[PDB]
Each structure stands twice: as structure tokens, then as C-alpha cells.
Ligand binder design. Structure first.
Ligand SMILES: *CC(=O)N1Cc2ccccc2[C@@H](c2cccc(C#N)c2)C1
Ligand SMILES: *CC(=O)N1Cc2ccccc2[C@@H](c2cccc(C#N)c2)C1
Lengths: 304, 304
């Protein structure tokens, strides 16, 4: 037992990280098969970022201007193209460490691991959730651009995120591996406010089930509620509205614990209305929303 | 910017994980060079664990009784010996994926990453701290025994922990890689209570410096304190006494932020005495103690 914010083992992703330099700009790239994926703003200087015309800036770049270094070995660039906000640099060598992989565009509320990198070198790994406002609350300094987010299903890496930007609020924005931003964000040095960050209700409920399984039970009560009654409380506390889809996905946790989903909702309602009165749940003093129902089952069953 | 509980990239450790089976018991082993390290209780059944005589049980085991499987390839066992609470199984093949490594016995208050494993397969990675009472608050199910804790200094893995046990309180106990338990714990199915878990004061202060650097500043006040005045407050709130050594290690963070260590102590004193009044610090509603001063500098500077 015990419950932790666990990231996926990052080995399969570390073997894909490379450094990409263009002019005076260096960031991270993802090497899969004979293609290196990186943010298109690698072709900009901070001077260019104010209002870049990516198509015009790219015309001045040739294959030989993109320096791609895998650890300490230089890759030969034989092609380049722009797909949305990412550059795809065709190299003459397929990565021998390419895992079985997929590119997936995740939904808000879903979780993933980020392998933060600097100059093609991995520094750490942490678990994230794509916020309902399509931002992530990460840890990214200059040079971290091109670091990726991913999930792992046994031997298959599903890449879902590439880091591009930090909002003036300190929150993070980026794209899926096809270069399409999550949310309304553009790759430009301009003030772009993120919307209201709501709490992922289905994840908080999943985490309350993780809590009961691991022994933290003080918050269980004698009450029940309805989806509509619960959503009136969710709306006041800027929680996402809970749907029957959410209830269905909580099914296995409800079955394992014997606590009906609407009974767990009544516990969450009371925790929202009364606070935690100085107590903790799984070592946390706030309601944790960055564990999906899938993460709870995976962690509580020992999936490798 | 942004601040996260970040674990080290686990790739170098995943390449060392193997499965070790003895009789009907299966757990994880660590393959480095031509040696596989695992908990000695691999030779026990749950029946044996009540009061095992490890030396007597081991006499009935030959090299051929220890089945070591690296992913899907079987390793040939050419020797075995017991060192404290670990078994060292000499194999006929050196691990080709052995990183540059060291075995280190960490101090309480120090942090490390755990690669939780089941049947020699990695499931996830998370950041831990060795508690002042020599327990860790991990996430370990049956079959997780033999999972290791480590730190990474560029290319060198310093293994510090091997998981052996779960206390009836749900907290975790284990050994360094020489098989010596941290704390007073023995490898036996017996009630062993852990001592008072105190809060790692130097880590909370380091995390308050991480908070100021990243923008969370509400807790800064107009006060100062002394080491002795602060320790009177630390003792009441079961915080570790702060020493000049702790102040010295906080030196770089004090220099970077311009906030004198004793001024930060006065902020911590007020947070201990008044609570957080419904506010958060780096997305947390409690005072975080599982970031050392080294982790804060490493994360805030981008060390790979
Ligand atoms: C995340 C990162 O490494 N960087 C550094 C960098 C290097 C060259 C050009 C831009 C950047 C910024 C950046 C500024 C403004 C907008 C974006 C986007 N998209 C990125 C971030
Ligand atoms: C952590 C783990 O995998 N296991 C399973 C197991 C398998 C065989 C023998 C013992 C165990 C237990 C266990 C019980 C009691 C004490 C210890 C220790 N040390 C380990 C845990």
C-alpha cells in the first residue's frame, strides 16, 4: 500500500532525446525512427518571437542549419518541413532506441509524465495533468522547450505533449506531436491569458477512492447525493460538472470498495462545503485532481 | 519556472532490473556488473517470515534454486552469498546496461527516486525522502520488494535503498545496497513500530526559498528570529532542530533570493504558529519537507 504521484519509467523516452540547434537557439528534439520532432520556434531568436512569420523565417533555413546531436553524435539532416507548430527534421539514421510509439492528442483531465530536458539531456520526470483550460503546471526553465509528455501501455509510448511556452502567469502551454497547440495558445511572445482553471472532479473522486483503499477514511459520511445536486456544489467550487460517463469510469473503484459513486460524491460535497478542518488525505491538505481513475487502478493493482 | 516533486530519469536503473525467484517467492533484483542484489527474504515463504533463521534456510538453497530472469532472458547463477539482509547472486554474464554506479548509505532528511517494480518490470518512478525515523512513505504492493532508490550525478547512479518491508502502519522500511536496514527494522513478520516522524526543517526552508523564486511570496514577513528561538518553535511542532550546518547549506538560496536564513526561519515560525489560513505554497496546503536544499538549486538551475 501507500499512494504517490508516480510518473512512468522514462527510459524509453530518454533514448529519444536529442539536442537541436538552429542559429543561436538550442532546444530539445524527439528522435523516433528517422525523424526528429522539435518546436518550430527553434528557428527564432527572442527578437523574432514578438511576431514571427514562421513560413518566411523557415525559407532562410537549409537542412545544414539544423544541428542535431544525439548525446555526443551528430545526426545528418536530409530533410525538413513544418507541420503546424513543430518541425520535422528527416535524418539519415533511424534511432536504434526507438520504442513502439504512438502520437495521441489527450483530453483535458487526462494525466501524463513529462521528461524535462535541457540541451537534449534528461533532468527529471514528473506526473502532470492537462488542465481543463489546456495548460499544464510544470517545471520548465529556458532550454526546456521540446521536452515531451507521454503515457506508456506495456511496451508502447503514447507521446501526447511537446513543451513550447510559458505564460506570464507561470503556467505551461504546448502542442501534441502533430504540432497543434492544446487550448487557444499561439507560439508568440504575447500575453495570452489562460481561462478559468477548474478542478477535475472525476480525478478527485478517483483519488478519494485511492484514499479509502489505502486507509484514509475519515471523510466518509452517512450521506448520499444526486448528479444534479452534486453539480450545483461543483459549479460553486469551480469543479467540472460530473456526468454519467465519469460515474461509469469510476465503476471499478466503486465495486472494489463497495462505496457507491454518489455516496463518494456526498463525501466530496461535504469536503467542499466544510474544508478539511486541519486534516490530511494521502498526505495532502487539499483535494488532489491529478490522478485519473485509470491511474488509481493501475497504481493499486501493480501494472508494469 | 514552476516547481514539481521531480524524480531522476530512471532509464539507467530500468536496465538493471531483473526478476528473482526462489521456490514460490518472486521479487526484484538489481543486476550490476556480474552480480544480482535482492532481499534475502526471497528464500522465505510467508510461513517462514514469522521468525526466519536466514542462515539455516539458505543452507537448503543451491545456485540452481535462484532463478534470475532479465526481461525474458535467463541468467546463469554461478555463486550466492548473504551480506546482511541482501543476497548477492553471482551470474556468468556482466549486465551490458550497467551504468557507472556507487552504493551509498544516505542520511535521514536526504531525498531519492524509487523505481517501483513488479516481477523485474518497472511500473513507475517517484521522489522520496528518508524520514528522520528511517522509514519512507512509498507506494509498494506485494512483489515490489527489491525495488531500489537512487540518486544520479550526471552519469553516476548512487543506489541508496532497496525495499524490503511494509510496517503495519503502511510506511516502508528497507536497506542500503550492503543489506543494512535503515533504522531499527528487522526483516521479519513482526510488529515493529517506527518512531516519531519529525519534519525535515532544512527541507521545508529550502522549499520556502523555491516558493519565493517561483513567485509564491505571501508568507514573507517583517520578522526575524534566532536559531535558539526558532528551535523552541521547531520542538513544539515536531520539526527537526535547525543547526548552523543547515543554515550553511541554505547559503546559496539565501544569496540568490537576498532573504537571510533567519528571516526565512521567522516566516516558517509564523506559518507554524498561524497555519496557512486557507492559502497554498507551490500548489501545496501543507509545508513540504521532501525537497533538500540541493534539489531546490538543481531544479531551479536546470541540472541534467
Ligand atoms: C521553452 C524554451 O526553451 N524557450 C526558449 C526559447 C528559445 C528560442 C525562442 C523562444 C524561446 C521561448 C519562447 C518565447 C516565447 C514564446 C514561445 C513559444 N511558443 C517560446 C521559450
Ligand atoms: C515487499 C514484498 O514483495 N513482499 C512479499 C514477500 C515475499 C516473500 C517473503 C516476504 C514478503 C513480504 C515481507 C513480509 C514480512 C517482512 C518482510 C521483510 N523484510 C517482507 C513483502
Amino acid at each position: 500500500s501507500g499512494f504517490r504521484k508516480m510518473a512512468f519509467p522514462s527510459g524509453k523516452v530518454e533514448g529519444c532525446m536529442v539536442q537541436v540547434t538552429c542559429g543561436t537557439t538550442t532546444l530539445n528534439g524527439l528522435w523516433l525512427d528517422d525523424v526528429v520532432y522539435c518546436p518550430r520556434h527553434v528557428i527564432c531568436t527572442s527578437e523574432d518571437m514578438l511576431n514571427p512569420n514562421y513560413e518566411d523565417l523557415l525559407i532562410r533555413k537549409s537542412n545544414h542549419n539544423f544541428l542535431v546531436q544525439a548525446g555526443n553524435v551528430q545526426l545528418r539532416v536530409i530533410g525538413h518541413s513544418m507541420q503546424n507548430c513543430v518541425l520535422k527534421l528527416k535524418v539519415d539514421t533511424a534511432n536504434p532506441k526507438t520504442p513502439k510509439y504512438k502520437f495521441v492528442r489527450i483530453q483535458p483531465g487526462q494525466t501524463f509524465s513529462v521528461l524535462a530536458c535541457y540541451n537534449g539531456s534528461p533532468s527529471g520526470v514528473y506526473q502532470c495533468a492537462m488542465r481543463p483550460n489546456f495548460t499544464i503546471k510544470g517545471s520548465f526553465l529556458n532550454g526546456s522547450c521540446g521536452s515531451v509528455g507521454f503515457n506508456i501501455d506495456y511496451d508502447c509510448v503514447s507521446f501526447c505533449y511537446m513543451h513550447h511556452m510559458e505564460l506570464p502567469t507561470g503556467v505551461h502551454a504546448g502542442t501534441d506531436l502533430e504540432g497543434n497547440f492544446y487550448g487557444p495558445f499561439v507560439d508568440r511572445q504575447t500575453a495570452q491569458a489562460a481561462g478559468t482553471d477548474t478542478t477535475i472532479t472525476v480525478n478527485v473522486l478517483a483519488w478519494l477512492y485511492a484514499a479509502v483503499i489505502n486507509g484514509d477514511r475519515w471523510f466518509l459520511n452517512r450521506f448520499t447525493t444526486t448528479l444534479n445536486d452534486f453539480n450545483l456544489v461543483a459549479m460553486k467550487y469551480n469543479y467540472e460538472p460530473l456526468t454519467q460517463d465519469h460515474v461509469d469510469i469510476l465503476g471499478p473503484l466503486s465495486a472494489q470498495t463497495g462505496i457507491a459513486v454518489l455516496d463518494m460524491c456526498a463525501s466530496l460535497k461535504e469536503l467542499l462545503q466544510n474544508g478539511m478542518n486541519g486534516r490530511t488525505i494521502l498526505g495532502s491538505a487539499l483535494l488532489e485532481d491529478e490522478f485519473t481513475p485509470f491511474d488509481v487502478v493501475r497504481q493499486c493493482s501493480g501494472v508494469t
